[PDB]
Design a protein around this ligand. Structure first.
Ligand SMILES: O=C1Cc2cc(Nc3ncnc(Cl)c3Cl)ccc2N1
Ligand SMILES: O=C1Cc2cc(Nc3ncnc(Cl)c3Cl)ccc2N1
Ligand SMILES: [Cl-]
Ligand SMILES: [Cl-]
Lengths: 124, 4, 124, 4
């Protein structure tokens, strides 16, 4: 086509989706990770995670308002990944890298899994 | 704005 | 903070939101523009438009499944702007620029209004 | 990935 493109548009959209999440606006699901609860937008979770994409395209699970993750999932690792989904920024630290990588593998977030593998390999 |  | 950032994350999220729109997945509103109907995600519309942001933060309008736009709004101009919201690409042409600019002013999409003004000024 |  002969379209023009606004370079900052995708980043501006994601910033506004994170503002809606922070104010709990039009969030339609709560993700339960052991004792912890995280409110989010189903569409953003699907857009970021192969696991959520599979869950919310399922004809019965698409209608659930609560999703319980596997008990082995660490709430902090989930929180870090949820923040990444809505911002593009990953808070990866020596103290959380193992939990973040395991959560990213479970959530099927291949680019996160890739950077965790590389950061671990460099420390070996 | 750019030509993509 | 000490975060790392994935450069293509925002663009990848927007691409997946457009894929969900094309397959009509988790769309929660229909925008009526005279005889034409457009299905979309309320969160994406709010993230792109000052008008939709105001509409869907309203305590009664947030729950509507159908929104009717002003009869002066051109369906093609709306279609072009909806495509822009989900892709960052604007199909701006001599034959549609006036309808696109008027629709962008109504929808409160200031960056689109700005490029339309500049493209019109250059042709004068 | 980059340092933002
Ligand atoms: O590593 C990742 C990140 C990811 C996201 C999604 N999401 C979607 N993919 C295709 N079309 C659609 Cl419509 C969506 Cl929402 C699926 C798989 C994976 N894997
Ligand atoms: O030209 C534009 C594009 C636009 C988008 C929005 N959206 C939001 N703004 C602030 N926080 C939130 Cl939560 C959203 Cl969704 C509001 C005004 C405008 N004007
Ligand atoms: Cl990822
Ligand atoms: Cl805009």
């Amino acid at each position: 086509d002969s379209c023009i493109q606004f370079t900052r548009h995708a980043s501006d959209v994601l910033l506004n989706l994170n503002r809606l999440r922070s104010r709990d606006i039009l969030t339609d699901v709560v993700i339960v990770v052991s004792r912890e609860q995280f409110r989010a937008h189903k569409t953003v979770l699907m857009a970021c995670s192969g696991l959520f994409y599979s869950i919310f395209t399922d004809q019965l699970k698409c209608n659930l308002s609560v999703i319980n993750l596997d008990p082995e999932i660490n709430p902090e690792g989930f929180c870090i990944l949820l923040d990444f989904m809505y911002t593009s920024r990953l808070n990866l630290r020596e103290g959380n890298i193992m939990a973040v990588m395991a959560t990213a593998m479970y959530l099927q977030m291949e680019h996160v899994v890739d950077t965790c593998r590389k950061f671990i390999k460099a420390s070996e | 704005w750019v030509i993509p």
